[PDB]
């Protein structure tokens, strides 16, 4: 009945020293029934990464919508959109559906190509921007993720250390949520290289 | 209501009852539940009264316009789909319909389409629709064959409505029979259930449970 | 330039008067009304011998009790026929009866003056509407793009109209049979047509109370042409 | 009333020609020449900027060559402002197709859509047509490398090599002479520049008076790269081919 | 919350004879347990030898009769003063009712007259436009009290011929206008006794080839 | 309607769909084909609310057939599935949404690969080796999880499908009157007339 | 909106905009239609003023409206696309509602109705296009060939031509086509169609397109070499 | 759909030999609060019609403005506005009845019950009722709200049927109306002592009486009533 | 000349030529006469045929039980205007239970025709109308011109040769106004009036059209053998 917890799923993002990390589970369900273990929730438009939790049809629809908009942006501007600018575009796009909203929990992550500054941001289903220095959480196990991140996190972690922290935050949060799990992916993002790692986790 | 229609060697048999009810009150025992769309096409009536009358008469206007425009008899498939597409537009609004569109053309042969106010459109050989449909199905399924004579097929339809008229409280009054061939339908009379029951009981040896 | 709905100094609508000129260029159509039925006949006028003449449809059914023949820009007639058929069927739906021939004609004529700056111009086609009803019996109407309609005992429209009308003036009487009317249409069509009249370049039709509106077969018309030739040679 | 002042842009002449379309084509014939040449391993787009100035900022300037998506580009001949209206429509159409089918729009489908828009302005609405002719250079996995053109009438046709704008008659003759089917991109680059160099109304062909672009499978492995040439890169290819 | 419907009570009765037709109705109008009027005409002459009554919610009843009367007027204008036949009037009324299928005229409509062969005709409608020609029909409040009596005394249902014991039915002999009026009066007298919304007065409209005649009779006023 | 299954093997896609149509109390038909051919190498099965199912399926069919004629080209299964998803994703926020779930089985002639797409009435699309809608997956997925291997033959796929149908016929309360099975491969679409 | 009446009558009873649309058809490349006993052939002229053309991708002159009906045209190319699109949409709409593909006569009647509508609608000009529509009705083996024109009139033809120099090829067809015995085979029908175009075309190289339509959705376009063999055989018989 | 806020109670009326009488109290109630004590609920239209209104007062004031506008409109391009082509009671009623039914059909009713009393051109008495549902009826006596339950029984004893109308004088009719108003004051908890009365006669025209009061009331017997049963003191 | 292209254009002398050209269409139409007494009002109309095979075009139209008109000019424009009157008469009856006054019916026709003379795109009506009726102020006769001008009269005539009938009525004014309670004599006077406009042709059984409305007489049209009595 509650649109935001029909399909299930989670996303988490973190900042480190000259790097950012964004991670998600791979589950798609119909309430109790597990349907797919390959439903990735992180997308990227140029160097800007976007994770989206919530109702799966809207996750897909919004990805297609932002691909659409960032492609037109690039043709007109003659440059790739930056994380700060994209964050504003997500907020604008969600709020235009104020009274008929997409049931989603987006998360932006990336490094500004000019300043080199790491950036993350979160949103509610209707556009409000949460721009945290440390971390952002989203999805059906957001409470769990808040608890993990708040204890595990420390500032200025090196890329390979940050990987371990965000991975352990996701995995242990997902294992305390019935509608999350069935696999996981972690993106480590530096100024001009991005590594993608699939994690081994329990499949129940 | 009990309405049926079935395909066989000799074409299509259509048989309906005559009763209309408002709650437990019997409003009418003389209802024409078969609509003569044209000399070749019949429609049955079940559910709410007006809806099936109004829109199947309307269907006859659309069929007449088709054959005026196309200089050719409308197919049963096309005629049934005009009605189903129309009611699908009204889906949710509260129409109440269960009908069989029956006809016989060169390209199709004898054809029956079950059309429904939820939008359902099904082609088939045997259909029973209404509050007494289950009673009529019993008699049909056990006695139906393809190689039935027009005489025997007519009786089976008459007998199946009687079965439902007896048991179903919201079915009864009288039975209207129709036989559909390629050259058109043929009316086979109004049969009062009050007289038909005692006649069938005596001649057939059935309804031994009832005293007469 | 000038308005489409403009009046001339004589008190006529320019566009309506010009559409009447287009009708004069059209192929001939004739109608004769009797107490036994109304007959409708047309000149097909194929532009080339390779054109399959049976595809030329200048006589058209509106309902079982009403038929129609056309002359002029025949493409313009399609929407008029569609409206006529719809009006006939719609009335039957609302009133469970056949529609009066006059009432049908009036409905068609209401379209005529719906043009301005609605459609951009008047119709460039005239219609002969023939039918039967219980109140006024066998009838023949002439529907113009002006919105006016006259009832006729007999009428000819198209390029050979004034010559044919003068012939209909002498030949028509109130005791004509259906057979006599059929031959009379054939006779007058043959008189005004450029090419020689046969079953392939001319078409007959009628409307009777019993059988309704019927377009004649080429075989049936061919016999009536042969019957005509013999009776003219008889004196 | 208002009828008095109406030019009636969408009417036939007694000869069966569309006045405004014909006059729009006359306008385009004075625009800078644009050339497209299709090869087996890519496509070339070359175009001449119209009588420029030394004070024009060339490196940030764009009047001829425009990007529709990653696979398709266009060369413009006519009113630049009119072309940008259509270009933005085409960019949107490509994105609509991508959103719907999750596949890049085939080149012809995009061309047909733009050409149909142009057609509409010649049949209804009473507005003037777009004074623009396009050369479409694009790639898809069905037909591979493709060249098309469209004009204000809304009619479009496919080409191996084609020119639009000024001196097309002279240009088309030179292309018809030296073009061969087994030609390569590097050869096509040379042909395009040589053709412009002979048809140009200017005294000499220089880097500051040109816009240049290539669509190559010369991208690392099975994929396509668009290259809009920079001023310095046009200067280098002019020296390489031996024009300056 | 606002309720757009109400119930004005009343009862109507149509009977078709061999060469005549009657449409009767009580003259009482009510809401709840109060009398609004002891004489409020309910059956109307609509022209073209057609009589009509729309029983139930009086506001919808008046609106419908008004619109049908209007339809008769425009039928004359549009079709050269042609007489609107009873079967055509019936079909027209179906479309008036179905036009408001999803916000219905809360009435039970009955019309009466002569068919095109001169025989008596009665048509009956439900609120949403379903209709059917009938020999006999009561409508409204006391319809359930009257119809069974008419099945027995007009169509001779469950009646057989003495001596045969159920074998031979009572033959369906035709009823005169005097005989029908007797059955109408007894139907309303009986309905008045057992139904609180029936009483005050009875107004009958009789239709023949000669035209439309009226008769009025007193009913109990309690 | 009720049960619709799909499985993708080495060189084909197999769709199985029940034959029963029930209007409340009675089973009106026991031979109903809950599928439409969208293109020569693309088949769509469907299940949902009465009327809406066929109306939607035929509407999609008409649109794909229109595309085929216009371009003289068959769309890829991936492209067709995306078109269908968008129509349902549009539908879910309409005045009256299409209450229809679909499986799209197609053979991509360009990549020479079979492809199975599962889409629900919300517009939720997933590519799968095997899929189902409604309660069908609750019974069958445990068997498919055990037995499916991605290099199966079409004959092995049909046997695994029989095992699924047998479990459904044992543990489901409703009598769905068997299934119509159809195979989609490089040669097109064909029906298995004995199952 | 723009409502100006562009198509109007003149004092002599002519609608000049419709007549000037026919002049645009006269300018268009020649198109020809011939129906045999069990087939219909559509021939089309390609003007050789345009070389360096890419024939793979260039819009072909014959268009499929459905799997069983084709449409060729003479006149404005851009205008023809609008009629073809509407016709294709209507063909699918007919299948959807009537559950049967369009007859050739019905499809023709629709296209002709569109053309007519543009002759008495405000703010629009007529289509500068005449069409030849050919094919076979569903489950029918009788060949069909119809013609339409800007005014909106349509009719059936045993054989017909439209476009530039259509007066000449119609002259050829009127003496060479026998109704009592039409081209019995595909070969005979194609041969007669190529012959008729050779009266007007110039070179028999890439200037002639041929499309053969047979019953039961059997439509195929002949290649250059296949047509070139007809061109060769015709002239070798002519040298006598 | 709304709820009535400020409301007016019963309107009562009857026919007599030469015309009609109508009456209504001057109170505007706000629930149980007797808020406004000077509200005129009889509204004359010309010299031949009086419209009596009960129910929602804001809707009454709207109807009052519609009638005022109706008189203005009838006078436009009408030389016989004060003679043959003056507004009749039957015209005024039919207009209101049309509006009431239209408004209920849009689910936004004028929350009122209305009685139009008057005399026609030919001298005939006119008296007809209409309410928020568009329901209409006529009778020798008519009354709204509580008047329907209490006034009608008293007024029907004077004029029980049509044949009793010529036998009823204006003195007898007014007496009955005034008595009914007293009874309503005894028994209606949303009524007031002050009321207005209007007579429309075919001979003497329109007589409009304001600031009438209920008089000759019986209350003295109250002094003897003690407790609710057993109490003696 | 330069100022007759459309209805939105005054001439230098302040004339509206399109309106005047519409007025010309009436003069080409067949003659029709109107006259009244204090009890009745009569319309007499000469119908026109196309030829001997054709019917005679109807000239009189009923608007209500108490009102109707006769036409001269474009017949379709009379159908549009008579349809409008039918609706207005009907709106008055349904809403106000009131028969529409003849004077007010003229005011409505005037205002409808006026809008067509001041706006671009449209055209004036090409027909003249003679409205008769009986309302609460007795019998009435109106004359409508498509310029918008409506006039109440005792008697009048419009169409071709209408001046002859108009002069006769101007002489007979004192006589026919007094014909009260005698319908046949009032019609006789109307038939004698329209006869002053005839040339070559005379009044035959299918040529003549008469209508009457009065105190206890609904608007009724007489054609065919019903008018042989008055020939
Ligand atoms: B039949 O019983 O379905 C019958 C068919 C109808 C066309 C005459 N329906 C009714 O009699 C219905 C009641 C009903 C009974 C059982 C199933 C469904 C419906 N009658 C009405 O809807 C009705 C409504 N108003 C007045 C009288 N009857
Ligand atoms: Mg009682």
DSSP states of I161-187: THHHHHHHHHHHHHHHTT--S-HHHHH
Q: Which among B2, B4, B203, B7 has a CA at the least distance from the CA of B111?
A: B7
How far apart CA F130 and CA F116 sit, in angstroms, is 7
Strands of chain C, DSSP E? 29-33, 38-43, 59-63, 66-72, 125-133, 137-143, 149-151, 154-157, 202-208, 212-215
- φ/ψ of residue E154, rounded to 5: -105, -45
Residue I86: which H helix or E strand, with range?
A: helix I75-96
Contact C154, I53 (CB under 8 A): yes
Q: Which residue has the tokens 């029709």?
A: I32
How far apart CA G186 and CA E64 sit, in angstroms, is 69
CA atoms within 13 A on the CB side of G66: 27
Candidate from E97, E106, E107, E130 with most ligand 1 atoms within 8 A of CB, to mutate: E130
Pocket flag, ligand 1, residue B76 (CB < 6 Å) = no
Query: What count of residues does chain F have?
Result: 195
Residue nearest to atom 8 of ligand 1 (CA): B20
Pocket flag, ligand 1, residue B49 (CB < 6 Å) = yes
Residues from A in contact with F at Cβ < 8 Å:
7, 28, 30, 33, 35-36, 38-39, 55-57, 60-61, 100
As given in the structure block, the two tokens for residue E20 are 């005549």
Question: In chain E, where are the structural domains located?
Answer: 1-222
Written out in words, the top-level CATH class of the domain with range C1-235 is: alpha beta
Contact C124, C80 (CB under 8 A): no
Residue nearest to atom 27 of ligand 1 (CA): B22
Give the count of beta carbons closer than 10 Å to the beta carbon of residue A153: 17
Pocket flag, ligand 1, residue B25 (CB < 6 Å) = no
List residues of B with catalytic annotation.
1
Which chains are within 8 Å of H by 3+ CB pairs? Answer: E, I
Maximum separation of any 2 CA atoms in chain G, in Å: 65
Q: Which among C3, A102, A61 has a CA at the least distance from the CA of I8?
A: C3
What is the domain range of residue F173? Answer: 1-195
Q: Where residue F19 sits, what CATH number does that domain have?
A: 3.60.20.10
* Closest alpha carbon within chain E to I97: E66
Q: Is C56 helix (H, G, I), strand (E, B) or coil?
A: coil
Q: Is D226 helix (H, G, I), strand (E, B) or coil?
A: strand
* Residues contacting E192, CB < 8 A, separation 6+: E26, E198, E199, E219, E220
Contact I94, E66 (CB under 8 A): yes
As given in the structure block, the two tokens for residue D236 are 């280098």
DSSP assignment of I180-219 equals: -S-HHHHHHHHHHHHGGG--S----TTTEEEEEEETTEEE
List residues of H with catalytic annotation.
1
Give the count of Cβ contacts less than 8 A between chain B and C: 17
Q: Is C64 helix (H, G, I), strand (E, B) or coil?
A: coil
DSSP assignment of chain H equals: -----EEE--EEEEEETTEEEEEEE--EEETTEEEES----EEE-TTSEEEEEEEEHHHHHHHHHHHHHHHHHHHTT-TTTTTTTSPPHHHHHHHHHHHHHHHHHTT----EEEEEEEE-TTS-EEEEEEETT--EEE-SEEE-THHHHHHHHHHTTT--SGGGSTT--HHHHHHHHHHHHHHHHHH-TT--SEEEEEEEETTTEEEEEEEEE--S---GGGGG--SSSS---
Contact I224/C at CB under 8 A: no
- Measured between beta carbons, which residues in chain B are less than 8 angstroms from residue E102? 93-94
How far apart CA D79 and CA D102 sit, in angstroms, is 34
Q: Is D203 helix (H, G, I), strand (E, B) or coil?
A: coil
Domains of chain G: 1-240 (3.60.20.10)
Contact C125, C158 (CB under 8 A): no
Domains of chain F: total: 1
User: How close is the Cα of F73 to the center of ligand 2, in Å?
Assistant: 80
Residue B49: which H helix or E strand, with range?
A: helix B49-70
Residues from C in contact with E at Cβ < 8 Å:
93-97, 99-100, 102-103, 135-136
Q: Which among C93, E136, E114, E104 has a CA at the least distance from the CA of B53?
A: C93
How far apart CA D108 and CA D90 sit, in angstroms, is 12
Residue nearest to atom 24 of ligand 1 (CA): B22
How far apart CA E119 and CA I17 sit, in angstroms, is 62
What technique solved it? X-ray
CA distances G197 to B58, G29, G162, G210, G212, Å, are 52, 11, 11, 10, 15
Residue F26 to residue B133, Cβ atoms within 8 A:
yes
Q: Which residue has the tokens 């273990």?
A: A37
Which chains are within 8 Å of E by 3+ CB pairs? Answer: B, C, H, I
How far apart CA I68 and CA I209 sit, in angstroms, is 14
Q: Given E97, E132, E144, which is nearest B25 (Cβ)? A: E144
The atom of ligand 1 lying closest to the CA of B31 is 8
Question: In chain C, where are the structural domains located?
Answer: 1-235
DSSP assignment of D84-153 equals: HHHHHHHHHHHHHHHHHHSSPPPHHHHHHHHHHHHHHHHHBSSPPPP-EEEEEEEEETTTEEEEEEE-TT
User: How close is the Cα of E51 to the center of ligand 2, in Å?
Assistant: 25
Pocket flag, ligand 1, residue B88 (CB < 6 Å) = no
Maximum separation of any 2 CA atoms in chain A, in Å: 47
- Measured between beta carbons, which residues in chain F are less than 8 angstroms from residue G88? 66, 69-70
Contact G91, G42 (CB under 8 A): no
How far apart CA C102 and CA D187 sit, in angstroms, is 79
Order of strands across the sheet that contains C212-215: C154-157, C29-33, C38-43, C202-208, C212-215
How far apart CA H136 and CA H152 sit, in angstroms, is 17
* Residue D37 β-bridge partners: D44, D161
- Measured between beta carbons, which residues in chain F are less than 8 angstroms from residue G69? none
DSSP assignment of A92-122 equals: HHHHTTTTS---EEEEEEEE-TTT--EEEEE
As given in the structure block, the two tokens for residue D147 are 């060249």
Residue E37 to residue H162, Cβ atoms within 8 A:
no
* Closest alpha carbon within chain E to B45: E130
* Residue C212 β-bridge partners: C208
Residue nearest to atom 9 of ligand 1 (CA): B47
Q: Which among H9, H13, H67, H69 has a CA at the least distance from the CA of H41?
A: H9
- Measured between beta carbons, which residues in chain D are less than 8 angstroms from residue G29? none
How far apart CA C12 and CA C64 sit, in angstroms, is 37
DSSP assignment of C205-233 equals: EEEETTTEEEEPPHHHHHHHHHHHHHHHH
Give the count of beta carbons closer than 10 Å to the beta carbon of residue B201: 16
CA distances F101 to D186, F98, F117, F124, H203, Å, are 53, 9, 11, 10, 81
Pocket flag, ligand 1, residue B20 (CB < 6 Å) = yes
* Residue G16 β-bridge partners: none
- Measured between beta carbons, which residues in chain D are less than 8 angstroms from residue F82? 100-103
How far apart CA D157 and CA A168 sit, in angstroms, is 60
Contact E44, E53 (CB under 8 A): yes
How far apart CA C28 and CA C164 sit, in angstroms, is 9
How far apart CA B200 and CA E34 sit, in angstroms, is 53
CATH 3.40.718.10 at D1-244, yes or no: no
How far apart CA A175 and CA I115 sit, in angstroms, is 79
Pocket flag, ligand 1, residue B133 (CB < 6 Å) = no
Contact H92, H67 (CB under 8 A): yes
Pocket flag, ligand 1, residue B21 (CB < 6 Å) = yes
* Residue A25 β-bridge partners: A184
Contact E85/C at CB under 8 A: yes
Domains of chain H: 1-233 (3.60.20.10)
Q: CATH for I1-231, among 3.60.20.10, 3.40.718.10, 3.30.70.1350, 3.30.565.10?
A: 3.60.20.10
- Is there an interface between H and C (3+ Cβ pairs < 8 A)? no
Distance from CA of E109 to the nearest CA of C (A): 17
Contact E132, B30 (CB under 8 A): yes
* Residue I73 β-bridge partners: I127
How far apart CA I87 and CA I77 sit, in angstroms, is 16
As given in the structure block, the two tokens for residue G137 are 């009705």
User: How close is the Cα of E184 to the center of ligand 1, in Å?
Assistant: 28
CA atoms within 13 A on the CB side of C191: 20
Order of strands across the sheet that contains A104-111: A42-45, A48-54, A104-111, A118-123, A129-130
Pocket flag, ligand 1, residue B211 (CB < 6 Å) = no
Q: Is the dihedral of CA A99, A101, A103, A106 positive or negative?
A: negative
CB-count exposure of residue G186 (10 Å: 0-12, 13-18, 19+): middle
CATH code of the domain made up of E1-222: 3.60.20.10
Contact C86/B at CB under 8 A: yes
- Measured between beta carbons, which residues in chain E are less than 8 angstroms from residue B53? 94, 129-131
Contact D154, D101 (CB under 8 A): no
Residue E130 to residue B54, Cβ atoms within 8 A:
yes
CATH 3.60.20.10 at A1-204, yes or no: yes
Q: At what angle do helices G186-198 and G224-238 cross, to 10 degrees?
A: 70
Give the count of Cβ contacts less than 8 A between chain F and G: 22
Contact H79, H38 (CB under 8 A): no
- φ/ψ of residue I60, rounded to 5: -110, 135
Pocket flag, ligand 1, residue B46 (CB < 6 Å) = yes
How far apart CA D141 and CA H167 sit, in angstroms, is 103
CB-count exposure of residue G171 (10 Å: 0-12, 13-18, 19+): middle
Geometric angle at alpha carbon C121, from C120 and C127, rounded to 5°:
135
Q: Is C18 helix (H, G, I), strand (E, B) or coil?
A: helix
The two beta strands, I217-222 and I208-214, are antiparallel
- Measured between beta carbons, which residues in chain B are less than 8 angstroms from residue F54? 119-121
Question: In chain D, where are the structural domains located?
Answer: 1-244
CB-count exposure of residue D110 (10 Å: 0-12, 13-18, 19+): buried
Q: Which residue has the tokens 């058209």?
A: C60
Q: Is the dihedral of CA D89, D92, D97, D103 positive or negative?
A: positive
Residue G100 to residue B77, Cβ atoms within 8 A:
yes
């Amino acid at each position: 009945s509650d649109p935001s917890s029909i399909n299930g799923g989670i996303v988490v993002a973190m900042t480190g020293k000259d790097c950012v990390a964004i991670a998600c589970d791979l589950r798609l369900g119909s309430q109790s029934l597990g349907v797919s273990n390959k439903f990735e929730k992180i997308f990227h438009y140029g160097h800007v990464f976007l994770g989206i939790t919530g109702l799966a049809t809207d996750v897909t629809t919004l990805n297609e919508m932002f691909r659409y908009k960032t492609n037109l942006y690039k043709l007109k501007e003659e440059r790739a959109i930056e994380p700060e600018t994209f964050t504003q575009l997500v907020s604008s796009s969600l709020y235009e559906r104020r009274f008929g909203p997409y049931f989603v929990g987006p998360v932006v992550a990336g490094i500004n190509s000019k300043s080199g500054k790491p950036f993350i941001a979160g949103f509610d289903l209707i556009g409000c921007i949460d721009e945290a220095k440390d971390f952002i959480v989203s999805g059906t196990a957001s409470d769990q993720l808040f608890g993990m991140c708040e204890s595990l996190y420390e500032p200025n972690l090196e890329p390979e250390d940050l990987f371990e922290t965000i991975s352990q935050a996701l995995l242990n949060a997902a294992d305390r949520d019935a509608l999350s799990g069935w696999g996981a992916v972690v993106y480590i993002i530096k100024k001009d290289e991005v590594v993608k790692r699939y994690l081994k986790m329990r499949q129940d | 209501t009990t309405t049926l229609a079935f395909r066989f060697q000799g074409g299509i048999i259509v048989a309906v009852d005559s009763r209309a009810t408002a709650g437990n009150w019997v409003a009418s025992q003389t209802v024409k539940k078969v609509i003569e769309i044209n000399p070749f096409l019949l429609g049955t009536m079940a559910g709410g009264t007006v809806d099936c009358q109004f829109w199947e008469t309307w269907l006859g206007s659309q069929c007449r316009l088709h054959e005026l425009r196309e200089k050719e008899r409308i197919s049963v498939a096309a005629a049934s789909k005009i009605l189903s597409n129309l009611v699908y537009q009204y889906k949710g609004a509260g129409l109440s319909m269960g009908t069989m569109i029956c006809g016989y053309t060169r390209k199709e042969g004898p054809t029956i389409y079950y059309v429904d106010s939820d939008g359902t459109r099904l082609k088939g050989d045997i259909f029973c629709v209404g509050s007494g449909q289950t009673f009529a199905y019993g008699v049909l399924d056990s006695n139906y064959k393809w190689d039935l004579s027009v005489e025997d097929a007519l009786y089976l339809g008459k007998r199946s409505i009687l079965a439902a008229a007896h048991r179903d409280a919201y079915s009864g009054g009288s039975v209207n029979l129709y036989h559909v061939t390629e050259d058109g339908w043929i009316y086979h009379g109004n049969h009062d259930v009050g007289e038909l029951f005692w006649k069938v009981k005596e001649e057939e040896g059935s309804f031994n449970n009832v005293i007469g | 330039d000038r308005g489409v709905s403009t009046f001339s100094p004589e008190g006529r609508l320019f566009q309506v008067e010009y559409s009447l000129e287009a009708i004069k260029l059209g192929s001939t159509a004739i109608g004769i009304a009797t107490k036994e039925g109304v007959v409708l006949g047309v000149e097909k006028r194929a532009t080339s011998p390779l054109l399959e003449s049976d595809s030329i449809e200048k006589i058209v059914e509106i309902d079982r009790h009403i038929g129609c023949a056309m002359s002029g820009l025949t493409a313009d007639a399609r929407s008029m026929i569609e409206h006529a058929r719809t009006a006939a069927v719609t009335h039957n739906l609302y009133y469970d009866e056949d529609i009066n021939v006059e009432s049908l004609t009036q409905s068609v004529c209401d379209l005529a003056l719906r043009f301005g700056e609605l459609m951009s111009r008047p119709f460039g086609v005239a219609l002969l509407i023939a039918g039967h009803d219980a109140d006024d019996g066998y009838q023949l109407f002439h529907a113009e793009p002006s919105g006016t309609f006259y009832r006729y005992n007999a009428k000819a429209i198209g390029s050979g109209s004034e010559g044919a009308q003068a012939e209909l003036l002498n030949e028509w009487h109130s005791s004509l049979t259906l057979k006599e009317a059929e031959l009379l249409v054939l006779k007058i069509l043959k008189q005004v047509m450029e090419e020689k009249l046969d079953e392939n370049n001319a078409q007959l039709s009628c409307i009777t109370k019993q059988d309704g509106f019927k377009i004649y077969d080429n075989e049936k018309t061919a016999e009536l042409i042969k019957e005509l030739k013999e009776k003219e040679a008889a004196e | 009333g208002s009828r008095r002042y109406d030019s009636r842009t969408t009417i036939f002449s007694p000869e069966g020609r569309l006045y405004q379309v014909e006059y729009a084509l006359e306008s385009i014939s004075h625009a800078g020449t644009a050339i497209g040449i299709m090869a087996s391993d890519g496509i070339v787009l070359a175009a001449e900027r119209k009588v420029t100035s030394t004070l024009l900022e060339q490196d940030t300037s764009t009047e001829k060559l425009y990007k529709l998506n990653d696979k398709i580009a266009v060369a413009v001949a006519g009113l630049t402002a009119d072309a940008e209206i259509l270009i933005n429509t085409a960019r949107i159409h490509a994105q609509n197709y991508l959103k719907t089918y999750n596949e890049d729009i085939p080149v012809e489908i995009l061309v047909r859509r733009l050409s149909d828009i142009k057609q509409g302005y010649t049949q209804h609405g009473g507005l003037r047509p777009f004074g623009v002719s396009f050369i479409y250079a694009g790639y898809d996995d069905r037909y591979g490398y493709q060249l098309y053109t469209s004009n204000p009438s809304g009619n479009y046709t496919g080409w191996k090599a084609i020119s639009v704008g000024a001196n097309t008659s002279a240009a088309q003759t030179l292309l018809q002479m030296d073009y061969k089917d087994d030609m390569k991109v590097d050869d096509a680059i040379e042909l395009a520049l040589k053709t412009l160099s002979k048809t140009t109304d200017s005294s000499a062909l220089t880097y500051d008076r040109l816009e240049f672009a290539t669509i190559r499978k010369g991208a690392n492995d099975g994929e396509v790269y668009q290259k809009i040439f920079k001023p310095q890169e046009i200067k280098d290819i002019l020296v390489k081919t031996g024009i300056t | 919350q606002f309720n757009p419907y109400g119930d004005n009570g009343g009862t109507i009765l149509g009977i078709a004879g061999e060469d005549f037709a009657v449409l009767a109705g009580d003259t009482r109008n009510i809401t709840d347990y109060s009398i609004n009027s002891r004489y409020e005409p309910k059956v109307f002459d609509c022209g073209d030898n057609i009589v009509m009554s729309a029983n139930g919610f009086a506001a919808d009843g008046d609106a419908l009769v008004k619109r049908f009367k209007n339809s008769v007027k425009w039928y004359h204008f549009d079709h050269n003063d042609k007489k609107l036949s009873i079967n055509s009037a019936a079909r027209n009324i179906q479309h008036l009712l179905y036009g408001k299928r999803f916000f219905p005229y809360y009435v039970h409509t009955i019309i009466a007259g002569l068919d095109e062969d001169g025989k008596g005709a009665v048509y009956s409608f439900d609120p949403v436009g379903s209709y059917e020609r009938e020999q006999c029909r009561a409508g409204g409040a006391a319809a359930s009290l009257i119809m069974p009596f008419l099945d027995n005394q007009v169509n001779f249902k469950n009646q057989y011929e003495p001596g045969t014991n159920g074998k031979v039915k009572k033959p369906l002999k035709y009823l005169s206008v005097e005989e029908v009026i007797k059955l109408v009066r007894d139907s309303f007298t009986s309905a008045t006794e057992r139904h609180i919304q029936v009483g005050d007065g009875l107004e009958i409209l009789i239709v023949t080839k000669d035209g439309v005649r009226k008769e009025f009779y007193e009913l109990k006023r309690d | 309607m009720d049960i619709i299954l799909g499985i993708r093997v080495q060189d084909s896609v197999i769709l199985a769909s029940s034959k029963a149509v029930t209007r409340g109390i009675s089973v009106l038909k026991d031979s109903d084909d809950k599928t439409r051919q969208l293109s020569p190498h693309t088949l769509m099965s469907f299940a949902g609310e009465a009327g809406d199912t066929v109306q939607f399926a035929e509407y999609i069919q008409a649109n794909i057939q229109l595309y085929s004629i216009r371009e003289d080209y068959e769309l890829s299964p991936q492209a067709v599935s995306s078109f269908v998803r968008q129509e349902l994703a549009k539908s879910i926020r309409s005045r009256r949404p299409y209450q229809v779930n679909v499986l799209i089985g197609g053979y991509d002639k360009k990549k020479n690969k079979p492809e199975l797409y599962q889409i629900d009435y919300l517009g939720t699309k997933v590519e799968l080796p095997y899929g189902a809608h409604g309660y069908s997956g609750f019974y069958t997925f445990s068997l498919l999880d055990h037995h499916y291997r991605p290099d199966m033959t079409t004959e092995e796929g049909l046997d695994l499908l029989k095992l699924c149908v047998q479990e459904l016929e044992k543990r489901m309360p409703m009598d769905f009157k068997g299934v119509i099975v159809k195979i989609v491969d490089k040669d097109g679409i064909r029906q298995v007339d004995d199952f | 909106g723009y409502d100006r009446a562009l198509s109007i009558f003149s004092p002599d009873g002519h609608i000049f905009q419709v007549e000037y649309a026919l002049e645009a058809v006269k300018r268009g490349t020649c198109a020809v239609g011939v129906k045999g006993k069990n087939c219909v052939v559509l021939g089309c002229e390609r003007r050789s003023t345009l070389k360096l053309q890419d024939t793979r991708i260039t819009p072909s002159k014959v268009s499929k409206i459905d799997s069983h009906v084709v449409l060729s045209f003479s006149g404005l190319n851009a205008d023809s696309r609008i009629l073809i699109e509407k016709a294709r949409v209507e063909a699918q709409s007919h299948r959807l509602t009537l559950e049967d593909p369009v007859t050739v006569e019905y499809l023709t009647r629709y296209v002709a109705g569109v053309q007519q509508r543009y002759t008495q609608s405000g703010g629009v000009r007529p289509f500068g296009v005449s069409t030849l529509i050919a094919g076979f009705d569903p489950r029918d083996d009788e060949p069909k060939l119809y013609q339409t024109e800007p005014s909106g009139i349509y009719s059936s033809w045993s054989a017909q031509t439209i476009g530039r120099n259509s007066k000449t090829v119609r002259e050829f067809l009127e003496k060479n086509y026998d109704r009592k015995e039409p081209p019995a085979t595909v070969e005979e029908c194609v041969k007669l169609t190529v012959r008729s175009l050779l009266e007007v075309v110039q070179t028999g190289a890439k200037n002639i397109e041929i499309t053969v339509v047979k019953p039961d959705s059997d439509i195929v376009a002949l290649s250059s070499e296949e047509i070139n063999q007809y061109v060769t055989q015709i002239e070798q018989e002519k040298q006598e | 759909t709304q709820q009535p806020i400020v409301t007016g109670t019963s309107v009562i009326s009857m026919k007599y030999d030469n015309g009609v009488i109508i009456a209504a109290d001057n109170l505007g109630s706000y629930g149980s609060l007797l808020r406004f004590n000077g509200v005129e609920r009889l509204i004359p239209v010309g010299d031949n019609t009086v419209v009596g209104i009960s129910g929602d007062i804001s809707d009454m004031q709207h109807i009052e403005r519609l009638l005022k506008d109706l008189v203005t409109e009838n006078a436009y391009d009408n030389p016989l506005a004060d003679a043959e082509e003056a507004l009749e009671p039957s015209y005024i009623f039919e207009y209101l009845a049309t509006v009431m039914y239209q408004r209920r059909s849009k689910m936004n009713p004028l929350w009122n019950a209305i009685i139009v009393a008057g005399v026609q051109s030919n001298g005939d008495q006119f008296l007809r009722y209409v309410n928020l549902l568009g329901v209409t009826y006529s009778s020798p006596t008519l009354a709204t709200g509580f008047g329907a339950h209490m006034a009608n029984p008293l007024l029907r004893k004077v004029v029980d049927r049509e044949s009793d109308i010529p036998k009823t004088t204006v003195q007898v009719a007014e007496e009955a109306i005034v008595n009914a108003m007293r009874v309503l004051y005894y028994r209606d908890a949303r009524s007031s002592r002050n009321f207005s009365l209007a007579i429309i006669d075919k001979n003497t025209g329109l007589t409009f009486k304001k600031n009438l009061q209920v008089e000759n009331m019986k209350w003295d017997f109250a002094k003897d009533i003690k407790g609710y049963g057993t109490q003696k003191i | 000349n330069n100022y007759d292209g459309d209805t939105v254009t005054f001439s230098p002398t302040g004339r509206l030529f399109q309106v005047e050209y519409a007025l010309e269409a009436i003069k080409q139409g067949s003659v029709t006469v109107g006259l009244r007494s204090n009890t009745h009002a009569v319309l007499v109309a000469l119908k026109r045929n196309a030829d001997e095979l054709s019917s005679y075009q109807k000239k009189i139209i009923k608007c209500d039980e108490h009102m109707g008109l006769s036409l001269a000019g474009l017949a379709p424009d009379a159908r549009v205007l008579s349809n409008y009157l039918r609706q207005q008469c009907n709106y008055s009856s349904l809403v106000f239970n009131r028969k529409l006054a003849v004077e007010r019916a003229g005011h409505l026709l005037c205002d409808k025709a006026q809008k067509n003379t001041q706006s671009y795109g449209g055209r004036p009506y090409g027909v003249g109308l003679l409205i008769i009726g009986y309302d609460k102020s007795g019998a009435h006769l109106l004359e409508f011109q498509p310029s918008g001008n409506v006039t109440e009269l005792y008697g009048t005539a419009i169409g071709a040769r209408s001046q002859g009938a108009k002069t006769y009525l101007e002489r007979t004014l004192d006589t026919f106004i007094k014909i009260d309670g005698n319908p046949d004599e009032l019609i006789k006077a109307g038939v004698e009036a329209i006869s002053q406009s005839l040339r070559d042709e005379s009044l035959t059984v299918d040529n003549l059209s008469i209508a009457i409305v009065g105190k206890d007489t609904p608007f009724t049209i007489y054609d065919g053998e019903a008018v042989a009595k008055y020939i």
